[PDB]
Amino acid sequence: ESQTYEVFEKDPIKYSQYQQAIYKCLLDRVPEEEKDTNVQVLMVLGAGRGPLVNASLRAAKQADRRIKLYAVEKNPNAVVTLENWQFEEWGSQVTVVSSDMREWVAPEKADIIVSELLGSFADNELSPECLDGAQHFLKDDGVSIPGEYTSFLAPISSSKLYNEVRACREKDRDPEAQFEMPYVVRLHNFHQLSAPQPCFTFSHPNRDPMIDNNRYCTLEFPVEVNTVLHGFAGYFETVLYQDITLSIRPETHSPGMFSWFPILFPIKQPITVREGQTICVRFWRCSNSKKVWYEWAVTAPVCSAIHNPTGRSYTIGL
Amino acid sequence: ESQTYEVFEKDPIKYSQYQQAIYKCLLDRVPEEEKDTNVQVLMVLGAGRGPLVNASLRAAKQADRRIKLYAVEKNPNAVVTLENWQFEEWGSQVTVVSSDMREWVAPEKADIIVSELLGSFADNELSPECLDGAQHFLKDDGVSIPGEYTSFLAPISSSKLYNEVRACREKDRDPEAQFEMPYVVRLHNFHQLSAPQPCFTFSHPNRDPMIDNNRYCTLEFPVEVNTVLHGFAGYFETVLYQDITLSIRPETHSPGMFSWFPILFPIKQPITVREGQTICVRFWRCSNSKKVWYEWAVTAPVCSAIHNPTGRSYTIGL
Amino acid sequence: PPNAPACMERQLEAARYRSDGALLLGASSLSGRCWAGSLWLFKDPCAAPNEGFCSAGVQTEAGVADLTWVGERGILVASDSGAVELWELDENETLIVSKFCKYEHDDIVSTVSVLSSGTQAVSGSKDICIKVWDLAQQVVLSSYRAHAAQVTCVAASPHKDSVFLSCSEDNRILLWDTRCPKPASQIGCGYLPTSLAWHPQQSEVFVFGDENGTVSLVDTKSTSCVLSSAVHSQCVTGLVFSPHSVPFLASLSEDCSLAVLDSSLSELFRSQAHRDFVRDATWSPLNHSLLTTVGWDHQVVHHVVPT
Amino acid sequence: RVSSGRDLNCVPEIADTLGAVAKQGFDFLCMPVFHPRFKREFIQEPAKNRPGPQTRSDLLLSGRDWNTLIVGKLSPWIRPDSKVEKIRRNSEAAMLQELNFGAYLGLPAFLLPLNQEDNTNLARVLTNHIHTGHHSSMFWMRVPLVAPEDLRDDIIENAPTTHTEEYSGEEKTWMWWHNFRTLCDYSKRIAVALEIGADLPSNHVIDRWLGEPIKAAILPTSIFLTNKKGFPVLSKMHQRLIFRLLKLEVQFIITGTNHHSCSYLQYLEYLSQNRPPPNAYELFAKGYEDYLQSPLQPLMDNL
Ligand SMILES: Nc1ncnc2c1ccn2[C@@H]1O[C@H]([C@H](O)c2ccc(Cl)c(F)c2)[C@@H](O)[C@H]1O
Ligand SMILES: Nc1ncnc2c1ccn2[C@@H]1O[C@H]([C@H](O)c2ccc(Cl)c(F)c2)[C@@H](O)[C@H]1O
DSSP: OHHHHHHHHOOHHHHHHHHHHHHHHHHHHSOGGGTTTOEEEEEEESOTTSHHHHHHHHHHHHTTOEEEEEEEEOOTTHHHHHHHHIIIIIGGGEEEEESOTTTOOOSSOEEEEEEOOOBTTBGGGOHHHHHHHHGGGEEEEEEEESOEEEEEEEEEEOHHHHHHHHTTOOTTSOTTGGGSSOEEOOOOSOEEOSOOEEEEEEESSOOOTTOOOOEEEEEEEEOOSOEEEEEEEEEEEEEEETTEEEEOOGGGOOTTOOSOOOEEEEEEEEEEEOTTOEEEEEEEEEEOSSEEEEEEEEEESSOOOOBSGGGSSOOEEO | OHHHHHHHHOOHHHHHHHHHHHHHHHHHHSOGGGTTTOEEEEEEESOTTSHHHHHHHHHHHHTTOEEEEEEEEOOTTHHHHHHHHIIIIIGGGEEEEESOTTTOOOSSOEEEEEEOOOBTTBGGGOHHHHHHHHGGGEEEEEEEESOEEEEEEEEEEOHHHHHHHHTTOOTTSOTTGGGSSOEEOOOOSOEEOSOOEEEEEEESSOOOTTOOOOEEEEEEEEOOSOEEEEEEEEEEEEEEETTEEEEOOGGGOOTTOOSOOOEEEEEEEEEEEOTTOEEEEEEEEEEOSSEEEEEEEEEESSOOOOBSGGGSSOOEEO | OOSSOSOOOSEEEEEEEOTTSOEEEEEEOSSSSBOOEEEEEESSTTSTTOTTSOSEEEEESSOEEEEEEETTTEEEEEETTSOEEEEEEOSSSOOEEEEEEEOOSSSOEEEEEEETTTTEEEEEETTSOEEEEETTTTEEEEEEOOOSSOEEEEEEOSSOTTEEEEEETTTEEEEEETTSSSOBEEOOOOOOEEEEEEOSSOTTEEEEEETTSOEEEEESSOSSOOEEEOOOSSOEEEEEEOSSSSOOEEEEETTSOEEEEOTTOOEEEEEOOOSSOBOOOEEOSSOTTEEEOOBSSSOOOEEEOOO | OOOEEEEOSOOSBHHHHHHHHHHHTOSEEEOOSSOTTOOOOSSSTTTTTOOSOSSOOGGGSOHHHHHHSEEEEOOTTOOTTOSSHHHHHHHHHHHHHHHHHHHHHTOSEEEEEOOSSOOHHHHHHHHHHHHSSSOOOEEEEEEESSOGGGSSOSOBTTSOOOOSOOTTGGGHHHHHHHHHHHHTTTOTTEEEEEEOOSSOOOHHHHTSSTTSOEEEEEEEGGGOEEOTTSOEEOOHHHHHHHHHHHHTTOEEEEESOOOOOOHHHHHHHHHHHTSOOOOHHHHHSTTTTTOOOOOOOTTTSOO
C-alpha cells in the first residue's frame, strides 16, 4: 500500500547506507581519468516509490559520475508514483520498467543491480529467487548491492509472546496453524536464552550452477540458565558493499534503523530447559515451482513436531 | 496411481474411437502414392501408461503408413511403464519424453499431436492450457486430436445429492466449502429440469493471438414443471477428428463408454422453481498464472451468491 | 508562441479546419498532477502539434471534451466542468478570448454541435440531458431529458436549424425536430450508438457508428433496409464526410486506425499511422484529398487520400 | 452538525479542488481516482502499450488525507456487463485496476454505479477484489430511488412514457440492489448511496430502503426548489425524507453543477438543527442502536 511504502521510506540511516554503498562502487568501477568516458548502467530492482533510485542520484552526485538509471517495479500502483517522479523531476536519466524482474528483457546488461528485497529474516521476502532471475542481465563482471545477506536465530523464552500467538487461532483453519508461521514483532517482554547464531546465507551474484536456494541448518544453542523456551527470534545481517552493512542482530545492530523489526518463529508446545543443557534446532528453507517456506524442529533437549511441514500452515508466494 | 490408469484404460470404445481418428488423419495426410516416402511425426501428449501410443500403432497398421512416435509424460511413475514398454516391445519407433509438455524442447515439429487431457467437464482437467504450451512444436499445418471440445450444463433437482453434498463438510475449513466445488458422480436418483445446453468450447490448434482461455457464459433454462433446483450437471462432447467423436451428453452419449461420469456443480441454497419459469445460470472459467477454477451464480428466478469466488473453495492447479 | 502556455497536453481531442485553411486544436491532459485543457490555432497545418510554432494559444481551467467552429472567429467548447464555453479570436487573430463560461450541465459535457444558422448550438452531456443554446444571448433555450443513459453524440442538421441527431448509451438514436411538441423520435434499425454524421448532400440520409466498430447507412424516410459494414474492430469514435460534391466517409476508431470509404461503404484507404486512439479527422478546405487526423499519441498525421 | 461531502467528476488540481471543497464546508470529496475520460486498453496493441503515468501521484496528498477525505469513483466508461465481449474483458481489467488503486491509497470508500438490471459481472469482479488482498475499503453502490428510464421527460414521440401505475415496476431499483448484494454474499463492505430524484416516487418505494444499509444519500443540485430570497430549499416531502435519513445517520453527498448564489449545505444544516426533539428513549438508546446483546438470565446467572 501507499502508506506501507511511506513507513519503509522514513528510515534515513537505511537509505544513507545505500547511498554510501553505491558511492564506493562508483569510484571502484570508474577511475578519475574516466569520469566522463564511462556511464554506469544502474538497475534498481523492486524500485517501490523511488527511494533507492533517489539515493542512487545522490550517490552519483557525491561520487561525481554519469549513470544510466532503470527502475524495474511489478506493483503498478507504485509504478504510477515512479512515472510521475520521472516526468516531473528525474527526466530521461531514469527509465521506469513496469515489470516483474524475472520477466523483463533488458536493452543491455547492468554494471550494478540494486535491491531492497529483504525482510526481517533476510531471504524471507524472497530476495534469492528474484535476483537469480535477474542475474542474466548483469554484466559478466557486475556488482549486486546487496552482495550478501545472512539470517540469524536465537532461542527465546516469553510466556507472554507465547500467549499472544495462541490468541491468533481462527475458525475454518488448523486449530494450531498460528504456531506454524513466523510473525514480525518488536520483541519486548522476553528473555534471550542464547546468543544469536547464523542460519542461512545468500550471496549475489551466484556464479555456481545448480545454485539451489533450498537449505537445511542445524544449530546448537548452549543455555546457562533454567527456563521454558517458546520460540526462536530471527534477525538479519547484510553486506551492501565492502564494509557498508545493514543489520538487525542486536549485538551488531545498525544504530537508529527503525525499519525492519525481528521475526518470531513459534513452537506449538513449550519446552523446559535445564541449566547447562543445549537447545538444538533444525531449520529448512523449502520450495516448489510455486511457493517458498520454512519448516523447523527442536531436537534437543527434547523433540518437537516438525513445524509447517510442506508449508501446510504458511507459505511465501513466488 | 497405477490402478487409476488401469481403470481409465479399460474402455475399449474410447480407444477404438481414437484409433479411427488417427486412421482417417493418416489417409488424409499421406496419399497412397506417398505410402513410403512420408513418415508422420506423431506426438501423444500425456501418454499415461501408453494406451493412446498403442492405438496409434494399431491406426498406423490399419491405415498402412510410417509414423515417428513420441510419448511425452510428466508423471515419472507412468514413465517407468513407458520405458519398460519401449524396451520390451515398441522399439526405437517410440521416443519416450519424461517431461511436462509445456517445458519440452522438441527435436522437430509434429504432424499430429494426440491427447486425452479431458475430464467430465471437458476443459476441467486443463487441456486448453497444456496443448497451448505445446502448440509451438506443431507444424504450421498440423492436426490436433481432439480438435475441439465443448462442455454442456443442465439444471437438476435432487434433494438426495443435495444431502450427499452437505455431508461433505469438514473441520478446519469453510463450513460451506463443499458447495463451492464440483464433484464427479454417476447421477442416479435425480431429475433433469431442462435439456443440456452448451457452455464453454475450446478448439485446437488455436491460431488466434491474445487466445485467452478465460470465459463467461449466460444460460437460460426453460422449466416446464414445478421443482426445487439443487445444482447443475455437467457433461462434455468432443471432436477427435471429423465425424469421429466422443460424448457423455445423455442425448448424444457415445454408447458403452464407461470412463467419464458426469460432474455436479452444487448451489449452497436450494431454489424453488415454478412451472413456466426460466432458471438462468452464469458460469465463469477463471485463472491466474498459478491456478484455474470456476465461479457460478443463479440469477433467475432468484439470485444466489456467486460460488467459489477467486477459487477460494476450489482450484485446479497449473 | 504568443501570450500562451508553453506546453500543450499529450491527448489531442479535436482537429477542425476553417474556411481559409487554418487548423483548430483542442487538447486535454487525461493524466498527471493537472487535468486541465487548452485551445490552439495553427495557420500552418504542418506546424501542428508544435506548441511554440502556433498563431494563437490559450489555457482552459478544465479539460476539453468536444469542440466546434462558431463561424471563423469563435470556438464552442464542451468541458468536463459541466460547462459550455465560447472562445472568440481577437482583432489580429493572435489571442483566444473566452466570451462565456456557462455551467448548466450537471456533469462533463461530452458533445457539442453548432446548429446550421450559426446562431444556436446543441450540447449533449453525461448528465443524460440535451440542451439548446443561444450563442448571442449567453443562455439555454431548452433542456431535454429524452435519454436514459449518458449522451454520447449530438449532430445538428446541415441546413434545418431545428433538426438534429442524438445517440446515447441507452441504445437510442433520436431524430429531433424542435418544430413538434414531442421533439425526439426514436429511429430504429443491436450495439450501442457511438458516433453520428449527417450526409452533406442528401439532407435525409445519415450514418452512425457503433461500439462494435460497425458503420451503418440510415435513411430518415424509412426505418428499414439499412446498408452496413464492419469497418473497425473497436468502437467508432467519429465520422466525417469529405468536402467533395460526391463526399467520402472517414471513420476514426479505438482500434488506432483511420478508414476511408465510398458510397457502398467499401474501404479505399486504411491508415495505421496512430499508436494511440484516433480522435478526429478534418479535410482541408483547400486540398480536398488531404485529411488531418489528431490522436492521443500527440501525432497530427496528414494523409493523401487516394481518390 | 451534518457529515457532508462534495461530488464532482472534474478535478484539474487535487490540492486546489480539495482546498476549495473544504473551504465551502465539506467533510469529504468524491472524485475520480483516474481521469473519467481516460479510456485504457489491456488486450490489443498499440493502445495497450500506452506510455507515461496512468493517473496523478499519491504524493499530492498526505496518507491521512486519503484515509479521511477522498471517496474514489469508478470511471463511467467501465462497463463489466456490456454485451460486447471485448468491452467486458477490458472493463473487468480496468475495474480491478481502479479498485486496487483505491485500495493502494487507503481510501475509506469507493463509489460504483448501479444503473442497469444486469450487474452480474460487475458483482463478480467486486467480490473478487474483496477476496484479493487485505484492504477494508467500504463500497458505496450509487443507486437511484427512481430509474433514469422512468423519470425521462415524455418527449419521444414513438416511445411514450408508460404512465400506468406499475406497483412492482415502481420499485425496480430495489431489486437491482437486492440481486447485487445477494450475489456478493451480503458482504458488510457493500453499502448503499441513495440518489434522491427531482420527483419523489411512491411512498411504498421509499419503504423498500428501510432496513437497508444506507451509508450515504446523494442529493443533486437539480432537486432544490428556489425560495422568495433566491436561495435553494427543498419541498416538504423531500424534507421528510431528509428527516428519516438523519435518524439513519447517513452522510449527505451534494452532486451536480451550481444553480444558486455552501447554500445547499446550509439548508441541510438548518434542517438538522430544526429537527424534532429526540425523547429520553432516543437519548438513552443513542449508542445502543442495532447493537446485538444477549438477554440477561438472572435466575441462572448473578447480575
Ligand atoms: N520479482 C519482482 N519484480 C519486480 N519488483 C519486485 C519483485 C518482487 C518484489 N518487487 C518489488 O520490490 C519492492 C520492495 O520489496 C520494497 C521497496 C521499498 C519499500 Cl519501502 C518496500 F516496502 C518494499 C516492492 O515495491 C515490490 O513490489
Ligand atoms: N502438461 C503436461 N505435460 C505432460 N503430461 C501431462 C500434462 C498434464 C497432464 N499430463 C498427463 O496426461 C495424462 C492424462 O491425463 C491421462 C492419460 C491416460 C489416463 Cl487413463 C488418464 F487417467 C489420464 C496423465 O498421465 C498426466 O500425467
